[PDB]
Amino acid sequence: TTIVSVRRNGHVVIAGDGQATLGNTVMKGNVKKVRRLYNDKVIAGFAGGTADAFTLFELFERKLEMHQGHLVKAAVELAKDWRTDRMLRKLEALLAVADETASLIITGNGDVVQPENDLIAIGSGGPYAQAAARALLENTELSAREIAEKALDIAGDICIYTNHFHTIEELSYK
């Protein structure tokens, strides 16, 4: 699995592969690891079990409503309940979410992180995508969509757990 997020020129995107591996075999190649949330004002992705993300995403929308859509404060409350609840502690996934404000990562350890330049790369192929997205973002004028697209393809060529099926959700704020 690999998921990438890039922010440039008033635009931010999240892209991820569709591969679902079971041991050494491919279970499903068209998995939708990216979706929209909170009246399509937020984009998010997940690396892990499909249901574990749908539970965390729904609660994340709840935390946004309590905090009026504030991304950072809602992410802390989600990370707070995630580590705390005996039910949620069993969940195993790596969330990625962003809005026009900023991009950040959320984890089951309770750790909330905003990468340098708001460049997120997670999953088994994440480091490979971060290496390619870092190269294009500094050496080219390409839009954030073009960077996350080409970066995810390179991660699929390298990572055996990642494929070239893609799902993207751009957000323009300019």
Binding site: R62, E65, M66, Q68
Partner: protein
């Protein structure tokens, strides 16, 4: 009882609440169906039942003030109850009991008002009567004029016909999905007979709940109304969502509503001989100040306006005795002087404001 049309109800509510017209329109329909029911024949009056309302929105946007002014508008008995109180415990029937005890004190004090003013003359007679009014039995006469058997039978009819009950924070008894969900949904079942037309005994008398109106409220950010038990969802025909208040609404709430808190502070300082006056820029920065605390820390709605205004006026309210005969102006500089130092420090805002 009152024959006011739904627009006449909303127009009266605008004198107190600011905006939230959809909630005002919804309560007006429920109060107007009351008068509509009395005009119907014997059969339909039993079949028709009150159109209960479920308000939805964040705290402090006026879900309660609509219910309060509505009951105050109709002179109906009123009570607010926290649904979580029954999670532990008290019986649910107490709702009707306390509503009648409020209806008793309401009709009784209203009965005293009729008994109050009641409670050739000789030239010497008028002379002492004039000296008496200039200064120098209310119990026995008001007791003689009052009809205790009437006040008790009346408060029941005031409850059974006009009674209004506001169940705050109903969203918190919805299932969160097992332990609390039984206790939470158990409260919903215990409330069910009150809206389904049961009978509750009280020391004042035997009350029936069939035609009582009810107004639930909840943020429903965690749970949703669909999480309510099916028997309860069908007993709340009318749904409405109250919008979050904006900075412009805070500016209106400070002034436009009748007996607004700014007007209250002006009359209070008038008691000390001091004259208060708020500039439009000063009212603006006050509303800007309350919005910053709600966005910086926790959003308590319009209730933030109360804590900020009292923090701003605390110096004047203390000195108001010594400032008698003076005209104090609350300008934009005065607001920034007493507040911007506080609003800037979020750690202190969680205490002082």
């Amino acid at each position: 009882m009152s024959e006011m049309t739904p627009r006449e109800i909303v127009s009266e509510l605008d004198k107190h609440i600011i905006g939230q017209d959809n909630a005002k329109r919804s309560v007006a329909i429920a109060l107007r169906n009351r008068w509509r029911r009395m005009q119907l024949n014997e059969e339909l009056r039993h079949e028709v039942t009150p159109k209960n309302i479920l308000m939805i929105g964040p705290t402090g946007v006026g879900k309660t003030e609509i219910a309060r002014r509505l009951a105050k508008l109709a002179n109906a008995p009123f009570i607010k109850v926290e649904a979580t109180k029954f999670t532990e415990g008290k019986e649910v029937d107490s709702i009707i009991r306390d509503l009648t005890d409020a209806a008793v004190k309401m009709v009784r004090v209203q009965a005293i008002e009729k008994n109050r003013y009641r409670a050739e003359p000789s030239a010497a007679r008028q002379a002492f009567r004039k000296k008496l009014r200039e200064g120098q039995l209310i119990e026995e006469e008001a007791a003689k004029l009052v009809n205790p058997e009437e006040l008790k039978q009346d408060a029941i009819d005031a409850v059974e016909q006009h009674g209004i009950v506001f169940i705050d924070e109903i969203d918190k008894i919805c299932k969160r999905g097992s332990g609390p969900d039984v206790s939470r949904e158990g409260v919903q079942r215990d409330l069910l007979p009150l809206v389904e037309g049961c009978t509750v005994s009280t020391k004042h008398g035997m009350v029936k709940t069939d035609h009582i109106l009810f107004i639930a409220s909840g943020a429903f950010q965690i749970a949703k109304p669909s999480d309510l038990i099916p028997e309860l969802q069908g007993r709340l025909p009318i749904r409405v969502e109250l919008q979050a208040l904006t900075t412009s609404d805070f500016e209106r709430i400070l002034t436009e509503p009748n007996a607004s808190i700014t007007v209250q502070y002006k009359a209070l300082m008038a008691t000390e001989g001091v004259n208060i006056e708020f500039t439009d820029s000063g009212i603006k920065r006050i509303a800007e100040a309350a919005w910053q605390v709600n966005e910086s820390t926790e959003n308590i709605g319009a209730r933030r306006l109360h804590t900020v205004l009292e923090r701003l006026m605390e110096e004047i309210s203390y000195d108001a005795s010594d400032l008698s005969g003076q005209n104090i102006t609350i300008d934009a500089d005065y607001v920034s002087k007493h507040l911007d130092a506080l609003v800037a420090d979020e750690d202190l805002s969680r205490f002082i404001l």
